[PDB]
Design a binder for these strands. Structure first.
Ligand code: 2ZY
Ligand code: K
Lengths: 223, 214
RNA sequence: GGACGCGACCGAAAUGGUGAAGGACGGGUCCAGUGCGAAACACGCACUGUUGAGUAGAGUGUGAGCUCCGUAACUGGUCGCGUC
């Protein structure tokens, strides 16, 4: 019944500003304390800010104090997080969490949003170049053969990869994106297949990078 | 002074049914204002314990919290397959709130040697000024693996990045990708491109490679 | 001896003025903590605390009591006088 939905996340260059929303449903935000908590990729959870009910008192972490402003629109039943003077270290996934009812959950955050991504960088939005990881010509390894696609030089996150439009899912591994020294992301998706049918069967990685309107389909054949 | 929450361990491997315990030690007194969360990859945190030892509604009773002074502990009496995730502690005794650095609990299993594959850079990318060589360690355990790059028997360093998947939902194995990045120029100067994999499940270190021209 | 009456002294319910006391005279208020109100702060309630708080009040009580100076019902006591 109760749910939280954050939006407004996206790419913004350093010094820029971004406004986050926290649409609530299944409950009234006026009766609860709303919190913002962010998580940089690979790191742990970091408390950002909050706002108390009835009093409207706000609280911020030192790392964001003076730049961030948390508010609440009861008319829209939505909480907002105004982020000004953004920095590269502000880059993370932003959650909105409800502070549960005291006699029931104490000061615990009983409900969390799905989180909205906020990337801060000077890098321009760029679609990825997809290259084939062609299956070796000789022998095997573990009993089969392997192939895949290299998704390189895209920005920002995220990107999705499928094989044969979702028909191929077994033995498929899509690795976590890695931020290159160039400021651009890069990742590879592979899949193990029988080396006996490398020629007679078709394998196609379906790459998808929406932030740049870049959807590509590359078929991976023996070179 | 901000209140510190020192969580430990940072990682943990246990079998299904095992009794595990995660600890968070506070720098100051936080009373009982301690919460425990569970987070799975790509998902939001889920509240497990509140007020140090109170079990949230709908949370299985195998999860239990306890407070000893400024030391708090999450206890999982018997691990179940759906229990393997990352757990964080939180203090909300005073602002600002403080989170533990997390504790990733991972499932144990029999040792599994990785299947190694090497992929030469595509002709399409080479005409772009950069060459990418990929080494693939596939389905192995534990995660502890060492991957080295050798071009013409020259050990590479500083020009490679690794990436590892989460523990697979079926066989609980890992997969890893090493990515060597070279210029088209430097790529053209040499012939034999090598990557050597050292893993516990391997009889001896395995080398997989090719020659640039052929 | 006794009764009644007058007066004085004393006592005295009551009352005006007065000036010392701080928590063992109280109430109010504030503060801290805890729990509660959909409620970490602010607001409100409840509980706890004076080794929490000014006897210059910081009170739309400095209220009660007491110190000290007066007025005083009287059903009071004593004494004198008049009368029976
Ligand atoms: C200044 C002060 N002190 C007070 C009260 C109090 C009550 C007790 F029971 C006690 O033991 C004590 F020492 C003081 C008090 O009420 N104030 C008033 C105000 F100005 F603060 F408002
Ligand atoms: K008083």
């Amino acid at each position: 019944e109760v749910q939280l939905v954050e939006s407004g996340g996206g790419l913004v260059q350093p010094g820029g500003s971004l406004r986050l929303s926290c649409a609530a449903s299944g409950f009234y935000i006026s009766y609860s304390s709303i919190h913002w908590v962010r998580q940089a990729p690979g790191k742990g959870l970091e408390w950002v800010a909050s706002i108390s009910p009835y009093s409207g008192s706000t609280y911020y972490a030192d790392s964001v104090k003076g730049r961030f402003t948390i508010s609440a629109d009861t008319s829209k039943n939505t909480a907002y997080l105004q982020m000004n003077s953004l920095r590269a270290e502000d880059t993370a996934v932003y959650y909105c969490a409800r502070q549960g009812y005291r006699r029931r959950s104490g000061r615990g955050f009983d409900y969390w949003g799905q989180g909205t991504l906020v990337t801060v960088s000077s890098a321009s939005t760029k679609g990825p170049s997809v290259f084939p990881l062609a299956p070796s010509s000789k022998s095997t390894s573990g009993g089969t053969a392997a192939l895949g696609c290299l998704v390189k030089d895209y920005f920002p996150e995220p990107v999705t990869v499928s094989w044969n439009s979702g028909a191929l899912t077994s033995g498929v591994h899509t690795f976590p994106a890695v931020l290159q020294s160039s400021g651009l992301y890069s990742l590879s998706s592979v899949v193990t297949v029988p080396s006996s049918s490398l020629g007679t069967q078709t394998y196609i990685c379906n790459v998808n990078h929406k932030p740049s309107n870049t959807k590509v389909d590359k078929k991976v054949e023996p070179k | 002074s901000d209140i510190q929450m020192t969580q430990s361990p940072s990682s943990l491997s246990a079998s299904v049914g095992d009794r595990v315990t995660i600890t968070c030690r506070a720098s100051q007194s936080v009373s009982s204002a301690v919460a425990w969360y569970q987070q799975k990859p790509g998902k939001a945190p889920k509240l497990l314990i509140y007020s140090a030892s109170s079990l949230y509604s709908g949370v299985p009773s195998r999860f239990s919290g306890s407070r000893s002074g400024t030391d708090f502990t999450l206890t999982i009496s018997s691990l179940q397959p759906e229990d393997f995730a990352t757990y964080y502690c939180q203090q909300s005794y005073s602002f600002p709130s403080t989170f533990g650095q997390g504790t990733k609990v991972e499932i144990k299993r029999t040792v599994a040697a990785p299947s190694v594959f090497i992929f030469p850079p595509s002709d399409e990318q080479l005409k772009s000024g950069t060459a990418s060589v990929v080494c693939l360690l596939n389905n192995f355990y534990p995660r502890e693996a060492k991957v080295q790059w050798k071009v013409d028997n020259a050990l590479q360093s500083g020009n490679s990045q690794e990436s590892v998947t989460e523990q697979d939902s079926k066989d609980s194995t890992y997969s890893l990708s090493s990515t060597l990045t070279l210029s088209k120029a430097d790529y053209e100067k040499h012939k034999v491109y090598a990557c050597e994999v050292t893993h516990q499940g391997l009889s001896s270190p395995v080398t997989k490679s090719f020659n640039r021209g052929e």
